[PDB]
Amino acid sequence: XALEYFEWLSX
Amino acid sequence: XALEYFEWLSX
Amino acid sequence: XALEYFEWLSX
Amino acid sequence: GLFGAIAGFIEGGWTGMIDGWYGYHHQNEQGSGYAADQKSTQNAINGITNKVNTVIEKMNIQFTAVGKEFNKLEKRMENLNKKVDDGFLDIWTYNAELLVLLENERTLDFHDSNVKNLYEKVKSQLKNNAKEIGNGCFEFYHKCDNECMESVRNGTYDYPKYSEESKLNRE
Amino acid sequence: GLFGAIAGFIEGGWTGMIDGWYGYHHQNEQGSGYAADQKSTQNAINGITNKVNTVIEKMNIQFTAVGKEFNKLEKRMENLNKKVDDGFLDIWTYNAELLVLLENERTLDFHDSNVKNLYEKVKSQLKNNAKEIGNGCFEFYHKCDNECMESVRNGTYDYPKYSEESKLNRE
Amino acid sequence: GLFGAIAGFIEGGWTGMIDGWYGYHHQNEQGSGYAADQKSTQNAINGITNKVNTVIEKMNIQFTAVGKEFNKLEKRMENLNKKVDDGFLDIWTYNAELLVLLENERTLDFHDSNVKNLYEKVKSQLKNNAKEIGNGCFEFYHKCDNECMESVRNGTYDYPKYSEESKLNRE
Amino acid sequence: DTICIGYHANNSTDTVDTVLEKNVTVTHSVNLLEDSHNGKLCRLKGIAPLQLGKCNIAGWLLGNPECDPLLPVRSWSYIVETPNSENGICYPGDFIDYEELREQLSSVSSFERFEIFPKESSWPNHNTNGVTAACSHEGKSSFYRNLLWLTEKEGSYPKLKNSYVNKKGKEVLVLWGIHHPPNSKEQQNLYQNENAYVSVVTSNYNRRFTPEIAERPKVRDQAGRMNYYWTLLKPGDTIIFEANGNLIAPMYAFALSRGFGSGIITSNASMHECNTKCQTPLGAINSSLPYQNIHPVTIGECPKYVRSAKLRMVTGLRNIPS
Amino acid sequence: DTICIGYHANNSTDTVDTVLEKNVTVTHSVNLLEDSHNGKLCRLKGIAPLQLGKCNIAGWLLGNPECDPLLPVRSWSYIVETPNSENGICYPGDFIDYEELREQLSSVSSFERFEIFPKESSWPNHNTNGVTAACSHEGKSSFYRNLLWLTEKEGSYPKLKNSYVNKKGKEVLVLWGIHHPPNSKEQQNLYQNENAYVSVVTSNYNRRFTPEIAERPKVRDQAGRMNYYWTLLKPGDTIIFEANGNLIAPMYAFALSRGFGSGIITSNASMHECNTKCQTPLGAINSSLPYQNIHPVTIGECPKYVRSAKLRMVTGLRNIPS
Amino acid sequence: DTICIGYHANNSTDTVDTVLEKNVTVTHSVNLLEDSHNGKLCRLKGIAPLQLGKCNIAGWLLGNPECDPLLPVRSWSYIVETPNSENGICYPGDFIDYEELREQLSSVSSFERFEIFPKESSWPNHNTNGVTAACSHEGKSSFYRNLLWLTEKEGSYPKLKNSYVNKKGKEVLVLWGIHHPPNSKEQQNLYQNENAYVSVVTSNYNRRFTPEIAERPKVRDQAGRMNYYWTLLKPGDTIIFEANGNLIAPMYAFALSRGFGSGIITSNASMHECNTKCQTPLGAINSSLPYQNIHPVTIGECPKYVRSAKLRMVTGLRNIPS
Ligand SMILES: *[C@@H]1O[C@H](CO)[C@@H](O[C@@H]2O[C@H](CO)[C@@H](O)[C@H](O)[C@H]2NC(C)=O)[C@H](O)[C@H]1NC(C)=O
Ligand SMILES: *[C@@H]1O[C@H](CO)[C@@H](O[C@@H]2O[C@H](CO)[C@@H](O)[C@H](O)[C@H]2NC(C)=O)[C@H](O)[C@H]1NC(C)=O
Ligand SMILES: *[C@@H]1O[C@H](CO)[C@@H](O[C@@H]2O[C@H](CO)[C@@H](O)[C@H](O)[C@H]2NC(C)=O)[C@H](O)[C@H]1NC(C)=O
Ligand SMILES: *[C@@H]1O[C@H](CO)[C@@H](O[C@@H]2O[C@H](CO)[C@@H](O)[C@H](O)[C@H]2NC(C)=O)[C@H](O)[C@H]1NC(C)=O
Ligand SMILES: *[C@@H]1O[C@H](CO)[C@@H](O[C@@H]2O[C@H](CO)[C@@H](O)[C@H](O)[C@H]2NC(C)=O)[C@H](O)[C@H]1NC(C)=O
Ligand SMILES: *[C@@H]1O[C@H](CO)[C@@H](O[C@@H]2O[C@H](CO)[C@@H](O)[C@H](O)[C@H]2NC(C)=O)[C@H](O)[C@H]1NC(C)=O
Ligand SMILES: *[C@@H]1O[C@H](CO)[C@@H](O[C@@H]2O[C@H](CO)[C@@H](O)[C@H](O)[C@H]2NC(C)=O)[C@H](O)[C@H]1NC(C)=O
Ligand SMILES: *[C@@H]1O[C@H](CO)[C@@H](O[C@@H]2O[C@H](CO)[C@@H](O)[C@H](O)[C@H]2NC(C)=O)[C@H](O)[C@H]1NC(C)=O
Ligand SMILES: *[C@@H]1O[C@H](CO)[C@@H](O[C@@H]2O[C@H](CO)[C@@H](O)[C@H](O)[C@H]2NC(C)=O)[C@H](O)[C@H]1NC(C)=O
Ligand SMILES: *[C@@H]1O[C@H](CO)[C@@H](O)[C@H](O)[C@H]1NC(C)=O
Ligand SMILES: *[C@@H]1O[C@H](CO)[C@@H](O)[C@H](O)[C@H]1NC(C)=O
Ligand SMILES: *[C@@H]1O[C@H](CO)[C@@H](O)[C@H](O)[C@H]1NC(C)=O
Ligand SMILES: *[C@@H]1O[C@H](CO)[C@@H](O)[C@H](O)[C@H]1NC(C)=O
Ligand SMILES: *[C@@H]1O[C@H](CO)[C@@H](O)[C@H](O)[C@H]1NC(C)=O
Ligand SMILES: *[C@@H]1O[C@H](CO)[C@@H](O)[C@H](O)[C@H]1NC(C)=O
Ligand SMILES: [Cl-]
Ligand SMILES: [Cl-]
Ligand SMILES: [Cl-]
Ligand SMILES: [Cl-]
Ligand SMILES: [Cl-]
Ligand SMILES: [Cl-]
Ligand SMILES: [Cl-]
Ligand SMILES: [Cl-]
Ligand SMILES: [Cl-]
């Protein structure tokens, strides 16, 4: 799983 | 439970 | 058990 | 918290910083604004992602588990099966709740530590070219334009470049 | 400890501070004395109370549990009942002892952190109007009466008010 | 890490320091070299020894445990024995892996804290007779021979002895 | 000119508990505890369950007349009984090792109901039309669909001896019954021998049954009893029945296939056109979360059951919009 | 002028263990492990236990003459057996499903001992005065208070058939016995029929017993045997006994009430005028602590048993009065 | 002039996992998980195991002719069966409470095989030479070494009654058998009585056995059956056999000693001249580590079994030689 909190994150 | 270590405590 | 990593250790 | 930054000497959070967990606010002649620190935020995200995933992974898939039946002359076996089911249930409820509490504590501490470490990194970069005005802020003894600000944010601040002017203003 | 204050740069505790976990000792012309910091002590008490209560709460009430009996042709069932009782006992003894050790470690660390944070709070309040003389003490570069001392203790120290006199003594 | 020293403001480790976990590197006229701090290293060794031994001790000796057999009309008892064995196995695998992860995290943090505390101890000993040049290093404002260096290492640095010369070089 | 260091705040109202403090509002968090189900009985990995309708396991296996007859061959992923199963054993008596039989059926994935001993062909010189009111159907007195009440014919009950060789290539569940009249008069009127016996043997099964006559309290208006027995006949093996009275003979038997992950559940919910990976008696769970507080009884790949009301992990920061 | 920051020290000598370090002296701590009991048997939530005195469960239920007769009606919170229970089964033989019976009694909270089959009225044309030396009382040969040894009268043992209808509105525990003489001579002298039998039926119970005659090693100076049986007769149901020999008939039976939290313990301690919420075989625990290392056997609301010698949580600081 | 503070780095490539991060290279670490065994069967604390060779427990206890006879007295630390045990029960039939018997043997540390009923001396007026092809040895038809097939002699089978008094000062395992012919013709030809019976009694054991004649599917070319029974005769107690047919009599019995830490394992490995404190079916473990992932079945003092592939604790620092 991933925490997609910001769109620039690398996930 | 309470830790009544000082009398000014709020417990 | 002992971690004998250095010879000066006290173990 | 354990490291004294969050809800500590940095009283509150920033609703205006929308692109990261930790970051900066700046004010100069060109204007003011917020900019998150992506390196530390990404590190924290990596860590906490691995923590959550670890917690999920440690719990195996629960395969089929249904009840059994016993006749009126098998009360002991029925009660033993029940004692087994209830025991395992107690233990897993305990384990789950405790693990979540412990890890929550450690997570908040982890954040607190990240914010403190960022603050200290900036402080050590700036030295006596600026003064700590509390609440996690620094006031420069020199003019710091957008380029200067960015040099601070991406860890390349040039102390000697502003050392003279700073020394003069600091007097 | 983890934060370096207790049994660290603050070598020992105060038998003379009887009204709190963390606090102050002061010395001026009007005299000297101890006074605990009630905010931090109350915070710590709240925390540790919630920790103890959490530990107690996670353990449910142990309702009736007695042995069973088996005839000479039920050895397998007897040994299985025994294996169940011994297994659960092992697991709970393990869980209890481990939880107590972990939480004890974290509690001492928590205290250490509280003392360090208090020290840093004072230091940041005083700035260069005083000097760190080690062992957690500050020596003022100005006269600090009871009112001044209390302003330090309740977090309202007026730095500009003594800045001049301090600058002069610091020279 | 949590305290910001290891892989933090002190970027890397020293392959050249072979006699301890934490220590010093010095450079003066008489020459340069590495010397571990034995007090902190010994403290850390004591701690981690007690941690490892604690983990081993909490696991009791596993005495004889073998399978049982059941006839074709005892499927329920066979499945219950199996449910017991599998349950206990799940719980112990979980406990072991989790305990090792938690303690590993805490161990790395512990080391980080030891290095930071050592650094701070030195800094507070030296005060303004030297300047922080980053990367965990101090540059003296005075000549510091082998005897001086050793006084720093064994915690007896004489600040007033070099205060004048340092003040002059610092100007 | 100034620069400040700070941390994220947002509008979130998620709360988590810690050890030092309860009820902390945080910016980001994940729920680890599944608490939602769809309230339906579903297919499990594309295979529908076996629903017994008005019957329990006993009623279905013996062939109680009151339940709608199933197709000859069935395959399922789990077995469902209804809480109010009125139709089970209709003629009073003990079902020996019934619980063990249920446990056997818990790992069966398919059955084929076939005629092991044809009615008009297996028991010559005996009557096969015996019926009872305890097992009524549409008002009329009837009997188990899978069993056959053999009685005396033309004033005589000759010793019978019949056998079946298992060439199905699978285990064959064979069921039979032993009748116990309340008096010797009825024993004679039915089986013409007061010293009757029944013998059932295979390669690994070997049992002998004797009538035990005594007056008994009425159950379903019956003072007589009927004990039900069963055995699993291995592939290639032969079962032999031999009797001179009291045998409630097998007529239909079950060829059984084995599988994994099955089980028997008691449920109220209804079957729907839907599919799931996890089924509980209350409904199906569609979730990848590690825990669930819905039900201890699960079939398939399910989260671990816990009693917890809440298991929420914080991922974000302590939220202080102030 | 100076101000210092510091922390509490006191005189405490409490020590706790941590992971990095053992045996740390601290200012404040709480003990989580209860290790004290009062060494007495007490009331549990205001209800006294059932003490069997010199008897175990078998001796009490069969009615062994050596134990002081209890009041007709009793209610309890738990059952106590003594370690040295000398009076149990006094006439040698097997007690069938005895362990299961104990497990049943483990959830019983009350009994009423009533005469189910009156002595001079239920078995006409039979003798009811049979006694034995294996069950002696005050020197003289005697017999179970709850059972009746039926023998031949005037050279004949007519077939008996008696029944009881349960109108107590509760489960009724019925016990009986089957006697097995060592030779056929004694079988004839006692029951006048060599081919005797006993039959016991209810709506859900159905068993038949046959004498098995053989010479056996003496137990309590008896070569004969006596097998003891029991059943729980549901409310409204009827039990029927039928025999022409060897029946050790029921005379008194038990009307039983069900409860929760009870159990059977073996203890040495004595009953006192005291009350508790938690009872162990060694004594009662008065505590709200989460753990106890006193005993694995508990009745009521007790702390969880652990093997630990010490479980002490630090609340205060590392204590350094130096 | 400069002084720096730093930390150890070295060349180590040990990696450990943490909660925030996986796969971290560290300077020092300890492995807590044992994964190595020597692939041999060894002595356990200086005592060799009991190896049954070609036999399982049944074959050894009954005295199957195909296995190499053991020494009269043996003492062991654990019992080993081979996976492919071809020689067990050689004459078809059920072994009653066999599993319970294995569980009894699991705490036995020694046996002495002694002649409880001598062949030419215990059963006069009966033949003792009965053999069968189901229990063949070296081609010829044979029989169990520990049992004796008693048949009719000179056209008659007189009632026998023999007994043994246990003066070994230990428990004595006694085994016997009951034969069940497929027809009454064979029953008569062997035991001359159609209404035969066998009786076995002790102070606490009491059982009666009746021949049950019926045609049965051939097993090992036998339509007859043989049921095997056993009992543990307490020190000082007496066992009595009495029969007029069908008794497969005991000839040798076992005096048994009890011990701790033993068990029964199925293994492939071979016995070697070696000693260990921990034995698994795959091999012996020589380790003081707290965990092992080798096998769930252990005998002696072993680490706790876990499924983990890796359990490595970091002791040193994060290793950064850069
Ligand atoms: C980090 O910040 C430093 C300072 O702002 C940046 O240096 C500037 O980079 C641009 C390229 O877009 C140059 O044209 C500017 O002249 C640089 N300023 C200076 C001080 O010369 C640097 O590019 C930034 N990036 C990284 C990754 O360091
Ligand atoms: C905290 O300390 C400040 C400084 O001592 C206190 O300010 C004094 O309060 C008293 C009221 O009793 C005034 O009459 C004094 O004149 C104040 N001193 C100054 C600097 O004017 C303040 O009252 C204290 N209380 C709190 C909660 O802040
Ligand atoms: C710690 O360091 C101080 C400073 O080096 C040491 O003091 C020296 O000790 C030697 C003995 O070998 C004396 O002869 C030197 O003259 C001392 N130097 C000074 C400053 O006078 C001290 O010995 C060291 N040892 C400890 C344990 O403190
Ligand atoms: C604050 O958080 C709330 C959620 O509690 C957000 O509400 C959502 O708003 C989005 C679009 O703005 C909608 O699509 C959703 O239906 C709303 N509810 C949920 C549950 O997401 C709200 O937008 C947030 N506001 C700010 C300023 O962050
Ligand atoms: C848990 O914390 C929440 C805050 O998230 C508390 O709810 C707030 O309570 C205050 C005081 O009544 C109200 O002013 C807020 O409006 C509440 N917030 C919301 C969103 O409801 C709550 O009281 C706490 N619960 C407990 C039992 O501690
Ligand atoms: C130091 O702690 C001890 C306890 O170990 C205290 O001893 C108690 O003293 C009080 C009154 O002073 C008595 O009522 C108690 O009977 C004593 N024992 C206990 C177990 O409490 C002692 O008072 C403390 N002294 C100081 C100066 O703190
Ligand atoms: C545990 O720590 C205690 C200190 O609380 C140790 O006991 C002290 O031991 C020293 C050295 O013998 C004595 O001088 C003190 O008088 C002791 N204190 C008391 C109150 O007895 C104890 O030795 C430690 N135990 C272990 C095994 O570590
Ligand atoms: C680096 O560590 C390796 C182990 O991975 C060391 O290799 C050993 O070297 C010693 C003597 O130098 C030999 O006796 C061993 O056989 C080698 N292997 C092992 C597994 O110990 C190597 O020596 C180390 N080198 C340095 C410079 O530290
Ligand atoms: C675990 O970490 C190790 C480092 O110890 C990784 O192995 C290194 O991988 C890099 C990139 O491929 C190679 O350049 C190194 O040579 C590898 N080191 C060794 C000694 O093999 C490894 O890839 C990591 N594994 C995972 C799955 O994270
Ligand atoms: C389903 O059964 C439960 C009892 O288990 C009962 O409470 C409920 O009313 C039933 N609901 C429906 C819809 O049948
Ligand atoms: C189950 O829920 C997930 C989450 O929305 C969804 O992606 C998936 O389609 C659902 N599956 C079914 C079969 O409904
Ligand atoms: C109580 O019984 C125990 C045995 O369980 C015995 O050790 C003890 O001596 C007895 N004590 C008393 C007072 O009877
Ligand atoms: C149990 O102990 C507590 C602690 O003193 C006391 O308050 C209570 O009265 C005691 N109860 C009884 C019934 O003795
Ligand atoms: C030992 O037995 C195992 C089966 O358990 C088999 O896989 C293996 O081939 C055998 N090995 C040897 C050497 O006999
Ligand atoms: C077991 O291994 C240890 C570790 O080398 C060794 O000291 C010991 O001799 C070994 N024991 C035997 C009996 O091989
Ligand atoms: Cl910014
Ligand atoms: Cl003060
Ligand atoms: Cl050095
Ligand atoms: Cl029957
Ligand atoms: Cl469908
Ligand atoms: Cl009987
Ligand atoms: Cl009282
Ligand atoms: Cl038999
Ligand atoms: Cl050897």
DSSP H helix total and E strand total for chain H: 4, 29
The strand pairing partners of I258, in sequence order, are: I108
Tokens linked to G4: 């400040």
Question: Whose CA is closest to I4, among F32, F7, F109, F127?
Answer: F32
Tokens linked to E127: 């700035």
Burial class (CB in 10 A: 0-12, 13-18, 19+), I163: middle
Q: Which residue of H has its CA nearest to E21?
A: H8
Burial pattern E79-108, b for ≥16 Cβ within 10 A else e, equals bbbebbbebbebbbbbbbbbbbbbbbbbbb
Q: What is the dihedral of CA H265, H270, H274, H278, to 10 degrees?
A: -20
- Amino acid symbol at G137: H
What three-state secondary structure class fits I142? strand
d(CA E33, CA F156): 30
d(CA I246, CA I195): 10
Q: How far from the centroid of its chain's Cα atoms is residue F162's Cα?
A: 33
Burial pattern I43-57, b for ≥16 Cβ within 10 A else e, equals bbeebbbbbbebbbb
Tokens linked to F94: 């979980």
Breaks (C-N over 2.5 A) in chain E follow: none
d(CA G86, CA G78): 21
E-strand ranges in G197-284 read 198-201, 206-209, 225-233, 238-243, 247-250, 252-258, 264-266, 271-276, 278-280, 283-284
Any CB–CB contact under 8 A between E4 and chain F? yes
User: Rg of the Cα trace of chain E?
Assistant: 27
d(CA A6, CA I259): 66
Domains of chain E in sequence order: 1-171 (3.90.20.10)
Report yes or no: G89 and G56 within 8 Å, Cβ to Cβ: no
Chain H: touching chains (3 or more CB pairs < 8 Å): B, D, E, F, G, I
Any CB–CB contact under 8 A between I206 and chain E? no
Neighbours of F14 (CB within 10 A): 22
Any CB–CB contact under 8 A between F71 and chain G? no
Burial class (CB in 10 A: 0-12, 13-18, 19+), F98: middle
User: Rg of the Cα trace of chain H?
Assistant: 29
Report yes or no: H105 and H76 within 8 Å, Cβ to Cβ: no
Residues forming CATH 3.90.209.20 domain(s) in chain G: 42-272
Q: Nearest 5°: CA angle at H266, between H263 and H272?
A: 85
> In which residue are the tokens 């070219």 written?
D129
The strand pairing partners of I233, in sequence order, are: I172
d(CA D22, CA D44): 10
Any CB–CB contact under 8 A between F109 and chain H? no
Neighbours of I131 (CB within 10 A): 14
Q: What is the dihedral of CA G60, G64, G67, G69, to 10 degrees?
A: 70
Question: Whose CA is closest to G143, among G153, G156, G132?
Answer: G132
Experimental method: X-ray
**Mutation to test the G interface, candidates E48, E54, E114, most G Cβ within 10 Å:** E54
User: Rg of the Cα trace of chain A?
Assistant: 6
Alpha helices, H only, chain E:
38-58, 75-126, 146-153, 159-170
Residue H219: which of I203, I208, I242 has the nearest Cβ?
Answer: I203
Tell me which DSSP letter residue I251 carries.
-
Give the experimental resolution in Å.
Answer: 2.3
Cβ neighbours for F30, distance < 8 A, ≥ 6 positions apart: F145, F146
Q: How far is CA D160 from CA D152, F23, F138, H34, in A?
A: 13, 30, 18, 67
Q: What is the dihedral of CA G9, G14, G15, G18, to 10 degrees?
A: -70
Report yes or no: H239 and H164 within 8 Å, Cβ to Cβ: yes
Tell me which DSSP letter residue H20 carries.
S
> In which residue are the tokens 């016991």 written?
H200
The strand pairing partners of E130, in sequence order, are: E140
d(CA G295, CA G288): 16
Tokens linked to I266: 């199925």
Distance from CA of F37 to the nearest CA of C (A): 12
Residues forming CATH 2.10.77.10 domain(s) in chain G: 1-41+273-322
For strands I50-51 and I225-233, give the pairing.
unpaired
Neighbours of H226 (CB within 10 A): 25
Give the H or E element holding residue H62.
Answer: helix H57-62
- Amino acid symbol at H10: N
Pick left, alpha or beta for residue H16 (phi over 0 → left; psi -120 to 50 → alpha; otherwise beta): beta
Report yes or no: G152 and G127 within 8 Å, Cβ to Cβ: yes
d(CA H24, CA I126): 82
CATH label, H1-41+273-322, candidates 1.10.10.10, 3.40.50.10190, 3.40.50.2000, 2.10.77.10: 2.10.77.10
For strands G33-34 and G291-292, give the pairing.
parallel
> In which residue are the tokens 């040894």 written?
H149
Residue I103: list chain E partners with CB under 8 A. 75-76, 79
Q: Nearest 5°: CA angle at F158, between F157 and F163?
A: 125
Contacts across the G-I interface (CB distance below 8 Å) = 27
Residue C3: list chain I partners with CB under 8 A. 28, 30, 315
Tell me which DSSP letter residue G125 carries.
T
Tokens linked to E68: 């069973």
d(CA I228, CA I179): 9
Closest Cα to atom 19 of ligand 5: G13
d(CA I88, CA F96): 42
Q: How far is CA D145 from CA D22, D31, D134, in A?
A: 22, 9, 22
Q: Which residue of E has its CA nearest to G308?
A: E58
d(CA F2, CA D106): 10
- Amino acid symbol at H255: A
Give the H or E element holding residue I111.
Answer: strand I108-115
d(CA F86, CA G304): 14
d(CA H111, CA H172): 9
What three-state secondary structure class fits I93? coil
Q: How far is CA A2 from CA A11, D7, D107, H158, in A?
A: 6, 27, 17, 86
Cβ neighbours for I213, distance < 8 A, ≥ 6 positions apart: I180, I181, I182, I183, I184, I187
Q: Is the CB of I11 under 6 A from ligand 9?
A: no
Tokens linked to I315: 């002791």
d(CA G130, CA G244): 16
Report yes or no: H279 and H266 within 8 Å, Cβ to Cβ: no
Tokens linked to F49: 């020894």
Q: How far is CA G276 from CA D101, G286, H33, in A?
A: 32, 7, 47
Cβ neighbours for G71, distance < 8 A, ≥ 6 positions apart: none
Q: How far is CA I35 from CA I270, I293, I298, I310, I311, in A?
A: 20, 6, 14, 9, 11
d(CA D38, CA D21): 9
Cβ neighbours for F169, distance < 8 A, ≥ 6 positions apart: F141, F142
Tell me which DSSP letter residue G111 carries.
E
> In which residue are the tokens 């005469």 written?
H115
Q: Nearest 5°: CA angle at H272, between H270 and H277?
A: 100
Q: What is the CATH code of the structural domain delimited by H42-272?
A: 3.90.209.20
Q: Which ligand is nearest to the CA of I198?
A: 23
- Amino acid symbol at I226: M
For strands H50-51 and H79-81, give the pairing.
parallel
d(CA G110, CA G105): 10
- Listing DSSP states for I205-243 in one string gives -EEEE---------SSS-SSEEEEEEEEE-TT-EEEEEE
Tell me which DSSP letter residue G69 carries.
P
Report yes or no: B11 and E24 within 8 Å, Cβ to Cβ: no
Tokens linked to H105: 């009694």
Q: How far from the centroid of its chain's Cα atoms is residue H158's Cα?
A: 37
Question: Whose CA is closest to H153, among H129, H184, H178?
Answer: H129
Cβ neighbours for F140, distance < 8 A, ≥ 6 positions apart: F126, F129, F130, F162, F166, I1, I2, I3
Report yes or no: G61 and G89 within 8 Å, Cβ to Cβ: no
The strand pairing partners of H171, in sequence order, are: H256
Tokens linked to H248: 């050790």
Residue I28: list chain C partners with CB under 8 A. 3, 5
Any CB–CB contact under 8 A between H66 and chain G? no
Residue E69: which of H27, H102, H262 has the nearest Cβ?
Answer: H102
d(CA D170, CA E18): 44
